[PDB]
């Protein structure tokens, strides 16, 4: 009959903590068969050797499989699990659970929160960071939009993607088959996978025309970017998982989403603009926030507003960790709550050194 | 009659003196009138940070050849307070304080005073001996500042020592124990004892509440203007009192507030207001912002857990510095501001003082 | 008559069960006979290492499926001790202990024997204090009985997993009006390791009870066990104990020997432990099943009079460095970096050293 | 006739000149005869390591004061090669090379010889490319001549300091319309080390010019020098070269020998290098002046087929781990962790290995 999306931002005590989700299920507030996606901030280092991502997904899949009476593999085929590691600074570990009910109510007036999920095919290692990944992500984004019943791409406000990376073993597999990979480095492969996936969002939503995107442009032409894409790499899967979040004229949700783009890592004005775009027009209305979701990164210039920083020169602390700490702190200082989603590495996600920022709010 | 000028100078590396050299060579700074240099250096700000000493040595070399005197005499004349750790987007820079005596014709204006303490025994670090001696030099520096009312003191910056392996062996040889065995934790004890010395001198807390057992344990005791930073390269405390005096002709003033926690942007705006900055348009009057940052002992901020105290890969003082610099930068639009970590007895638990120096 | 078999298995990731599954599916391991798994997992080996729990969860879920029982029942039945930190060239792997009942002839001298025991859960304010010492000592005695070892001189390695403090657990303690032994999460690992190690020494008669008190724990480094190997983690709230030795009631084709490294570069002690396990020449290194060792930074900040920065390095915690060093030393003697090295050797060997054991085919 | 003396001096900090000053004040070192100082400094050895420059500044300032000349003049006369990173048990120290002409007899056989040479400054876009290879090769040949070595087989170690790319230098290159060899500050160290190492192999005839191109640099690991040892730093724009060998025109009471570690745990190569320097037994190890070696993670992510995480670890860069490992292996053979080990051995020995030299008293 009618889609109603509910979104639950749940604090976690550890990567494997399912207790807060279990409390909401046991109280009857969440039917677990209606969960379509879980977006996590997990407290590993968010870089190459972060096993909290897989630990969290495994723990959630185990739990939901037992509650639903189905196998873990069926849960993973059915539910998007997107775990973004790295909870630096004051950023609070948490999960955001997306529930899509089917209700016997009319659509609410105007446009209200809508979500769609789609998975791509698995990618061969030589496809990561290249047009194959761009075009297949674009196709899956369009599918998720239709799943969400969103017709106008301007009504898409955040497209969250989990994407793969290259391990030593996967690079060697490509080599044994006579293929080369986009880069022979696991950490850099995360940027290429994030960037190709983001360009696929831009292609699908019409933010960039197809004839401007080529292999040569991926992670090189920073004038090309999506204003709503948010992509995050991990070792666990070989495909991309996509969540499209926007507003539909055919939704019964009591929530809406809005967004802006941070021009740089300290752009508090963009945080306030994203809040306003989600209907939050004053500090007292900040209690309507469900979550804030943003991309952060170290600008390629090595500077912010003309001031040097060491992020790209610091050999002890990877720059994606520093970028996450900074943007989480900036958002937290505006909204008064560090339990917000910030992910690092914003290739083709907002301008160089900036990133999209979206707000899910109660109406 | 004293006048104080303050110069915030970006640096390209710990040993970079070129920005200071440009201002001297252009006549805008007379090196003989420099009384203190407060630096943010790009080492890790913890135990094995050698950018502090590298920066001090490079500056001492340079000012010695420019003043015709020896390096050793320069360090006895000028306070060098190098705070390592430039995490996040925090920009390495130095802040140079110039104090020139100029006869001139109301209103309170920036005044600065310096005072070195005697050298401390390692057994005295983090204990009442350090507290009482620091309180002495603060009043001494209050004097050089020509400031009579402690309510006119807005920031008290201190470089304090730490306990090395050999300084522990020394107290061991001499038959005396030290406040703690961990060299990293001695930084917190030296920082906290020094801070209590400021609260004691300024009458922020009465002396009968301060004991050895209260140091780094009773967080109800704290100064609202103290800012202390530890390093390996000395054994005494170097104190800079900054405030406003009627007997001053400076074109600057200093205000301050206290960050209740690491994301307290309201306190940043209050500090700006206390220094005469009332709108975003007037932000260009900032000379520098100076703040203390730290991880709260509860492991939380506004009820939300974070990993700073559980993260074995990144020391919590590094994270706290990144966070508070990003918050201040997002208010003033400029990450080149002074943030130092470890705020023991400096503002409440999880918070710290924040001061703004601004043109009038 | 018990027969112990030990399988050292390379792993591709913390959750990799494929090597164990291959041995089960080939018929080489009956999963019902597994009594303990000792892992090296590739997290940072410090407070915020979740690879330890990820590995245990993955193994318990796999074995639970294979055996037709719940995960909870598997973790009550099988010791899972995951030591994080695979720095330097140290290769991630698990060592699986299988114990079966057999009818076999007697008097094979003494051969490898294994026993397992668990303590109760500890409150945060008990870590690093006599309650942990005494509970561990009782469990060590139980594990010895499980191993059918009555003579403590026949115990060659006592491997323990023990808890640690997080900021959240310290705050729980404060809310209940209790003070923890130390207010630093990393240092809490040393107190839990040290108290657990002194519990081994108490149980084996290496130190008399009247010499152990709260004040001595992590302060009197001349108190130590020569066989204790303890390892701390966020993923458990009790201690798990594996006693490994030799007994006359054993039909194993394996034996264990040990020595004590006096410092982190004591290759002589590696060769002495090999010899105590019956490996008398480089030509016989192929009989190694695994080498198990403790490593640590010396409190003096030195090795043979030479300074190092392990205790002063704010970027890399000293147990990470000690593991890389001692693994490299062992690897250079035996020609294989896939050996067990655990860092932080409080009351485990002298200050700056630690026990080292070798499991070898006869 | 040239006489070379070499003093290995422990340091308490990067700026510690006291051990050197002791040797000068007692008359054992004439400061005007110092031609090079090779240091291990206790920074992280990567991009943001300022202990290297801090050490050089302190040494240049001290020597300029002793010789009555300017800092500028000292750095033009003396090679200062500070290699950061003292991980594991590796002990910070400096190795001071003293060379003087003498009127003395010969030939007592071949004895230690040293020569020094500097290259021009490099643009950022020349690092890791043939401009650096060829100019380094030119300078190695010059340093050979300064050492009075005509036979490349008598060169046993070629130590080099070379530049790296910072974010600001990469951005500047971009503004000038020039792309650099790699857009990554950490990886730029590998390209500078590797191009410099190939310069050595070219100068010494270890590899034909035919085989070297931009495309081969940090790609064809079959190309390598067996004596090159290179180390990158943020504190200079050129390459500084120290050639160390033996020649018939030497009156030193020292010799150098070398081998090549095939991998990070090749203790046999350590003993081979000792033997090549005349140290035939454990009893003769008191003749060591220093051991100098290159260490690295193999591009395969393995040692003798065993996986490690050095290339995967986002918390600790692999050159830090490699240094800890190889220093520990050497220390366990010679009983002393105060030896020189530098990380990143691109085109320096085979993939995963590196050269190792020993300077010994005859
Ligand atoms: O923030 C991020 C970005 C990514 O690519 N992968 C993560 O785990 N965390
Ligand atoms: O921020 C800080 C605090 C300290 O104690 N020492 C430093 O170098 N930086
Ligand atoms: O070991 C090393 C290698 C390098 O490239 N740079 C350093 O400072 N140390
Ligand atoms: Ca971007
Ligand atoms: Ca405070
Ligand atoms: Ca020990
Ligand atoms: Ca090599
Ligand atoms: Cl209800
Ligand atoms: Cl864990
Ligand atoms: Na799991």
Author numbering:
A (entry chain B): 0 to 283, 289 to 367
B (entry chain D): 1 to 105, 108 to 283, 289 to 367
C (entry chain A), D (entry chain C): 1 to 283, 289 to 367
The authors write:
By soaking the APO RMCAH crystal with the cyanuric acid analog and a competitive inhibitor barbiturate (BAR), we obtained a BAR-bound structure with all four monomers in the closed conformation. However, the significantly improved resolution, along with structures with other ligands reported in this study, enables a more thorough examination of the complex as well as comparative analysis. Both planar and non-planar BAR were used in the refinement, and the planar BAR fit in the electron density better. Even though the BAR electron density shows nearly three-fold symmetry, the bound BAR in the active site is likely orientated in a specific configuration based on its positioning relative to the surrounding protein residues. At A’ and B’ positions, the distance between a ring nitrogen atom of BAR and the backbone carbonyl oxygen atom of Gly84 and Ala232 from RMCAH are 2.8 and 3.0 Å, respectively, while at the C’ position, the distance between the α-carbon atom of BAR and Gly348 is 3.2 Å. The present RMCAH/BAR structure refined at 1.88 Å resolution shows that the αBD/αFL angles (110° and 5°) and the distance (3.4 Å) between the Ser231 γO and a substrate carbonyl group are well within favorable ranges for initializing the nucleophilic addition reaction, in contrast to unfavorable parameters for the other serine residues (Ser83 80°/35°/3.6Å, Ser347 45°/65°/3.6Å).
As observed for AtzD and ACAH, the active site of RMCAH lies on the pseudo-three-fold axis within each monomer and is formed by similar sets of residues from all three domains. As observed for ACAH and AtzD, each of the three serine γO atoms is in close proximity to a lysine residue (Lys40, Lys161 and Lys299), generating three pairs of Ser-Lys dyads each from one of the three isostructural domains from the same monomer.
